[PDB]
Amino acid sequence: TRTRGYVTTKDGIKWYYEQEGSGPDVVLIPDGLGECQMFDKPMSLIASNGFRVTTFDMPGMSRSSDAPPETYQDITGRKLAGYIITLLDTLDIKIASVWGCASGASTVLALCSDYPERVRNGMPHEVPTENPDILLHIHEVDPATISQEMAANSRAYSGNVEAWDALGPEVHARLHDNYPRWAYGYPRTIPPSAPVKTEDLHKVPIDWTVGASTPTKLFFENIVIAAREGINIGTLPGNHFPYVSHPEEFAKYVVETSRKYLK
Amino acid sequence: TRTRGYVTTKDGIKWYYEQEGSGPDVVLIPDGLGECQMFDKPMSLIASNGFRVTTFDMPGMSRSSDAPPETYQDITGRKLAGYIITLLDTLDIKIASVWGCASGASTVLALCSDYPERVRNGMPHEVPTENPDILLHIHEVDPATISQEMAANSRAYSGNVEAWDALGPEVHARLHDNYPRWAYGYPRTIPPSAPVKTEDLHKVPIDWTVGASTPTKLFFENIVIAAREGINIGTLPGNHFPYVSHPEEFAKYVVETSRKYLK
Numbered sequence: 001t002r003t004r005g006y007v008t009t010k011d012g013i014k015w016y017y018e019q020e021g022s023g024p025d026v027v028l029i030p031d032g033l034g035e036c037q038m039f040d041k042p043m044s045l046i047a048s049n050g051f052r053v054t055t056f057d058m059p060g061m062s063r064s065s066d067a068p069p070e071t072y073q074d075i076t077g078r079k080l081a082g083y084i085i086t087l088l089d090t091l092d093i094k095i096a097s098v099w100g101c102a103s104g105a106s107t108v109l110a111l112c113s114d115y116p117e118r119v120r121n122g123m124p125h126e127v128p129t130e131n132p133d134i135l136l137h138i139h140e141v142d143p144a145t146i147s148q149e150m151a152a153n154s155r156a157y158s159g160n161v162e163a164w165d166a167l168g169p170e171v172h173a174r175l176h177d178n179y180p181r182w183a184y185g186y187p188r189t190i191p192p193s194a195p196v197k198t199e200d201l202h203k204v205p206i207d208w209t210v211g212a213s214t215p216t217k218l219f220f221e222n223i224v225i226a227a228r229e230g231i232n233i234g235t236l237p238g239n240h241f242p243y244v245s246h247p248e249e250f251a252k253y254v255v256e257t258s259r260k261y262l263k
Numbered sequence: 264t265r266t267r268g269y270v271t272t273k274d275g276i277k278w279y280y281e282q283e284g285s286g287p288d289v290v291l292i293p294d295g296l297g298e299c300q301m302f303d304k305p306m307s308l309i310a311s312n313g314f315r316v317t318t319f320d321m322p323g324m325s326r327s328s329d330a331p332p333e334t335y336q337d338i339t340g341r342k343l344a345g346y347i348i349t350l351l352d353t354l355d356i357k358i359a360s361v362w363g364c365a366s367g368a369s370t371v372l373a374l375c376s377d378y379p380e381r382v383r384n385g386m387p388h389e390v391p392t393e394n395p396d397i398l399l400h401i402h403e404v405d406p407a408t409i410s411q412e413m414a415a416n417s418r419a420y421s422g423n424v425e426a427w428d429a430l431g432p433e434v435h436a437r438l439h440d441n442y443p444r445w446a447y448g449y450p451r452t453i454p455p456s457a458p459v460k461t462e463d464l465h466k467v468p469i470d471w472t473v474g475a476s477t478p479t480k481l482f483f484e485n486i487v488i489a490a491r492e493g494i495n496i497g498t499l500p501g502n503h504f505p506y507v508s509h510p511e512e513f514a515k516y517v518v519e520t521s522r523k524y525l526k
């Protein structure tokens with residue numbers, strides 16, 4: 001029993017969102033591809049443990065594509081956080097345990113830094129601080145090329161190609177269109193704006209993760225930052241999409257981690 | 264010119280060792296396989312930069328096989344350090360910049376902890392603190408099976424299969440015999456004895472590394488420990504054998520790092 005619906009916020013974004021369960025709030029912010037169907041399985045699992053779980057397609061992406069161009073251009077964690085806060089307000093969510101990978105992780109940190117009152121606890125996964133070589137010129141090519149290149153890269157970082165493929169043609173068709181939009185608005189601006197400064201990290205509890213199979217160099221700096229700052233740091237099975245590759249393990253982490261901070 | 268030969272120390276180890284160059288000492292400790300031909304290329308490079316480089320096959324391994332059984336059983340970093348110290352004494356090496364991967368890294372740390380007076384600076388790479396699942400039962404199967412599995416594992420962790428293969432038939436034939444001996448004496452005892460406590464890490468300069476391409480989880484703890492302790496930590500290209508996969512880059516690292524500490 002999950003709500004699937006739409007809401008147009010004051011910033012003009014026509015959001016597609018989902019919600020399941022009752023209890024303390026948990027918010028699942030997608031990665032840069034902004035496709036919330038990736039959370040379908042773990043959403044129910046988390047919800048079944050006594051939480052109200054909310055997810056949504058990101059601005060300009062997938063079902064939330066009816067949004068103003070600025071909401072998906074020159075993107076930063078802080079920009080996204082603003083939009084999300086507006087969304088939470090309309091959804092009547094006061095405080096939540098928040099998860100997010102990549103740009104979603106950047107968003108989580110922005111939320112913890114600038115909107116601590118709304119965050120129980122934050123769960124960032126693979127915060128981009130330095131892009132790998134595959135993305136260096138992605139914004140410079142045409143859409144068709146972007147979709148071809150990015151569909152491959154994503155599959156390669158999937159952590160489980162079988163599960164990835166298993167998302168289905170509808171999802172993959174949505175992703176096809178998301179790729180160029182993500183490329184033009186995310187990779188150049190997300191990393192330099194990473195909210196990983198000292199003052200961004202200590203207002204609320206944070207449990208940070210990197211993929212177990214992810215090549216060490218990719219998110220190496222996340223590890224060092226966390227360790228030096230005294231922030232809980234660890235790994236999760238898979239790579240960049242633990243929610244897709246390892247839904248069960250992912251759900252257990254969210255539940256167990258969020259549960260620690262409940263009163 | 265490169266010198267190659269044997270020396271029998273007072274602990275009964277008939278060591279196979281090589282040296283090249285003149286200047287401050289650099290010691291290259293092998294990984295668990297104990298095969299020093301792996302350093303051949305970088306050794307020349309390092310030596311050409313004004314250092315006297317020394318390397319050797321490890322006790323019981325390859326050409327250093329004529330050694331007491333005790334020297335290749337229940338191995339720990341401290342145990343290896345003792346043997347190395349005896350060797351350095353015989354070779355009249357008073358102080359050196361020391362490199363080591365895996366069990367070699369454990370040895371480096373042991374040297375930094377217990378024999379700081381002989382270490383100018385330590386360069387540990389991928390210190391085992393927790394074995395991956397592939398090693399869980401390695402000590403329990405037939406020698407042929409060990410050799411087969413470890414040959415595969417090693418190639419998989421090589422960071423460059425072509426360069427790995429290109430070590431040559433002589434080297435691989437030696438490795439084949441080393442695998443079972445390594446299995447019985449190293450993986451069970453090396454990790455628990457890792458000299459990674461606070462008390463082991465501050466006596467002499469340390470520059471710690473992990474492979475860029477190595478799956479994050481494998482040596483994740485190395486990074487956290489180093490960061491927590493205020494020790495220089497970074498990556499090197501490749502995986503578990505940077506000296507084989509990326510000899511130029513490896514040589515550069517050793518030279519630059521060691522040069523920081525000369526006076």
Ligand SMILES: C[C@H]1CCCC(=O)CCC/C=C/c2cc(O)cc(O)c2C(=O)O1
Pocket residue numbers: 031032033101102103104128131132134135153154157182186187188190191240
């Ligand atoms: C698209 C997704 C998987 C895309 C597959 C892929 O190329 C993974 C590279 C790891 C970096 C991702 C990333 C980098 C940025 O600068 C900005 C981002 O929004 C992302 C990001 O969202 O990762």
Ligand SMILES: C[C@H]1CCCC(=O)CCC/C=C/c2cc(O)cc(O)c2C(=O)O1
Pocket residue numbers: 294295296364365366367391394395397398416417420445449450451453454503
């Ligand atoms: C044999 C070498 C290349 C062996 C290739 C391999 O399986 C790499 C797994 C990473 C672990 C290495 C390791 C673990 C130990 O407990 C003791 C060790 O001596 C090693 C070690 O020396 O790694």
